[PDB]
């Protein structure tokens, strides 16, 4: 329905979000995921730190080079959960995966474009209150990721900018309302009202 759908992956659950995205691609919807480092995972931090360490201990014995590749960034962790749910070894698989981009923080083309959420993957909606969980970016520097502070820094900087953007916009829509008012209660108004508009 849109050409590209941008997902603020904040507060989402890794594999559920993963799941919807893998289907969205296979059906030909271009997707970019952003803020991949504020992605959630159910279960307390230690468990997932432990779970990851399992993943780590797996490597081709005679040549660790060809072994399973342990990507440590949140984007890449998240991209793992996704690839797992796509038949990536086929052309159809590759094609699907080429419709996908994942980022940590929200880099420049997207920083000024609307993002959406995916309610059936929203942690706050799905998880039962009280149930413990894990933050991805924090999982990642835990197991080696190098750019948690660099992203937070560029994010705080984006957040200033984006909020003055919003302050100004909110101030403009104020105007159009106080422009409108005049015609809010007009005769055409009433006629539109008769039609649900």
């Amino acid at each position: 329905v849109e050409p590209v759908v941008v997902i603020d992956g904040k507060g989402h659950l890794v594999g559920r979000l993963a799941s919807v995205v893998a289907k969205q691609l296979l059906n030909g919807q271009k997707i970019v995921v952003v803020r991949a480092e504020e992605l959630n995972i159910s279960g307390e931090f230690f468990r997932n730190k432990l779970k990851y360490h399992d993943f780590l201990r797996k490597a081709t014995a005679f040549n660790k080079t060809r072994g399973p590749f342990h990507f440590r960034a949140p984007s890449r962790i998240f991209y793992k959960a996704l690839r797992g749910m796509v038949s990536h070894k086929t052309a159809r698989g590759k094609a699907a995966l080429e419709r996908l981009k994942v980022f940590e923080g929200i880099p420049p083309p997207y920083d000024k474009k609307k993002r959406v959420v995916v309610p059936q993957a929203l942690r706050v909606l799905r998880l039962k209150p009280g149930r413990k969980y894990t933050t991805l970016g924090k999982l990642s520097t835990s197991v080696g990721w190098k750019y948690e502070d660099v992203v937070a820094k560029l994010e705080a900087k984006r957040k200033v900018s984006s909020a003055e953007y919003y302050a100004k916009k909110r101030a403009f829509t104020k105007k159009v309302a106080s422009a409108n008012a005049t015609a809010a209660e007009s005769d055409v108004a009433k006629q539109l009202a008769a039609l649900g508009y």
């Binding site: 329905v1 691609l25 296979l26 030909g28 159809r92 699907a96």
Partner: protein, 106 residues
């Protein structure tokens, strides 16, 4: 008239298939806007088109069409089934497709 479209937007998802065997002879279409089988009943029988480009010109045209109609509903969520005169190319899974408002009973 920025809009000129007299059709509903579709995607080509799959051939009909079990876990390990596909039937090329039926295509599973996903009609945009259709959540439930009850809806998808509207479009049954209505003609579909897949429209692709080529290199060799034919009817003075580099654009071609594969035609067929929506034939029965699929599953619980508005996916619907379709047969075409020929059989869609499978490279087209996830391609766009077009579902027209005729044959009509409106």
């Amino acid at each position: 008239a920025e809009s000129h479209r007299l059709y509903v937007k579709g995607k080509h998802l799959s051939y009909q298939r079990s876990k390990r065997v596909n039937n090329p002879n039926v295509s599973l279409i996903k009609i945009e806007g259709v959540a439930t089988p009850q809806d998808a009943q509207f479009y049954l029988g209505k003609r579909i088109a897949y429209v692709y480009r080529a290199s060799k010109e034919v009817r003075g045209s580099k654009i071609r069409v594969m035609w067929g109609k929506v034939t029965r509903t699929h599953g619980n969520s508005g996916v619907v089934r379709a047969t075409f005169r020929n059989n869609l190319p499978a490279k087209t899974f996830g391609a766009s497709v077009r579902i027209f408002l005729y044959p009509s009973n409106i």
